[PDB]
Amino acid sequence: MGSRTIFCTFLQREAEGQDFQLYPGELGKRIYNEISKEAWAQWQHKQTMLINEKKLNMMNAEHRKLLEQEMVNFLFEGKEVHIEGYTPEDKK
Numbered sequence: 555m556g557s558r559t560i561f562c563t564f565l566q567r568e569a570e571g572q573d574f575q576l577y578p579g580e581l582g583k584r585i586y587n588e589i590s591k592e593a594w595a596q597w598q599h600k601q602t603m604l605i606n607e608k609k610l611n612m613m614n615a616e617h618r619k620l621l622e623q624e625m626v627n628f629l630f631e632g633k634e635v636h637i638e639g640y641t642p643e644d645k646k
Contacts, residue, residue: 564593564629580637581622589629597625 560571569590575582576594585594604610604624610617626634 560587560590562590562593563588563632564596565590569593577622580635580640584630584633584635585625593629597629600628601625 558570558573559568561567562569562571569592571590572586572594575586577583577585589597601621601624605612605617605621608620610620612618612621622636626636
């Protein structure tokens with residue numbers, strides 16, 4: 555169809571949503587799903603500085619997971635659903 559208007563959770567409104575997942579695993583899914591481009595632009599800005607201030611490292615897994623932690627409190631500050639290890643056996 556020609557109608558793409560999701561409902562952001564950060565803004566709590568109806569946005570156009572994204573077209574391609576930016577984050578990995580499920581996290582990127584919820585963002586790309588519930589976190590519209592507008593909301594993402596609010597995190598990305600705080601993300602870049604959060605990494606420089608908290609002294610993070612996207613190259614390190616210890617910090618990477620940390621970022622995904624902060625973003626939640628900012629955008630997903632309600633679900634806090636974190637999953638790691640999804641492997642479909644045959645059905646959902």
